[PDB]
Amino acid sequence: SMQEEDTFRELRIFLRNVTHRLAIDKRFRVFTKPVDPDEVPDYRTVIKEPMDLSSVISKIDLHKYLTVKDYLRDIDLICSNALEYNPDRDPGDRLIRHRACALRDTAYAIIKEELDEDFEQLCEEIQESR
Ligand SMILES: Cc1noc2c1[C@@H](O)[C@@]13CNC[C@@H]1C[C@@H]2N3C
Ligand SMILES: Cc1noc2c1[C@@H](O)[C@]13CNC[C@@H]1C[C@H]2N3C
């Protein structure tokens, strides 16, 4: 229905706003673009599903996310990818792990404060009906 298409358009407006706020935070610059295969040819041999915030906006605009939960799976993948590629005790690895945990915790905190649980449940029920 038109009403259902309006619900999904509001979901995309909400997701774009959360994503652009994460992308302007200086702590999360390393997560704003895909890893450059030239600088890091080893990356795509270890990490099987690369993800970054520019890819997330592209996916919002392609209608890939029908629920909040769908979107948070990709935020969780940006974080898990950084934890698995950078697992060592040295300061460069510890700094990117701390920034990756902060990106994940920040996204979940904005959604807890600013999403209504009934809007999230409406999107699930429309998705399940399709
Ligand atoms: C902050 C914030 N930004 O959007 C929202 C908030 C909450 O206060 C609220 C709870 N009931 C009405 C508010 C609208 C929406 N919502 C989840
Ligand atoms: C994102 C991301 N996840 O692990 C890494 C990144 C890069 O920023 C990088 C700096 N340039 C290539 C290096 C691989 C590595 N590291 C910190």
From Swiss-Prot:
Tissues where the protein occurs: Highly expressed in estrogen receptor positive breast tumors and in osteosarcoma tumors.
Subcellular location field: Nucleus
Domain of life: Eukaryota
Induction (record text): Up-regulated in breast, uterus, colon, ovary, and stomach tumors. Induced in breast cancer cells overexpressing NCOA3 or treated with estrogen. Down-regulated in 5-fluorouracil-resistant derivatives of the colon cancer cell line HCT 116.
Domain spans labelled Bromo: 3-114
Chain coiled-coil ranges: 108-130
Subunit structure: Interacts with ESR1 and NCOA3 and these interactions are enhanced by estradiol. Interacts with acetylated lysine residues on histone H1.4, H2A, H2B and H3 (in vitro).
Homology family: Belongs to the AAA ATPase family.
Function: May be a transcriptional coactivator of the nuclear receptor ESR1 required to induce the expression of a subset of estradiol target genes, such as CCND1, MYC and E2F1. May play a role in the recruitment or occupancy of CREBBP at some ESR1 target gene promoters. May be required for histone hyperacetylation. Involved in the estrogen-induced cell proliferation and cell cycle progression of breast cancer cells.
Protein name: ATPase family AAA domain-containing protein 2
Gene coding for it: ATAD2
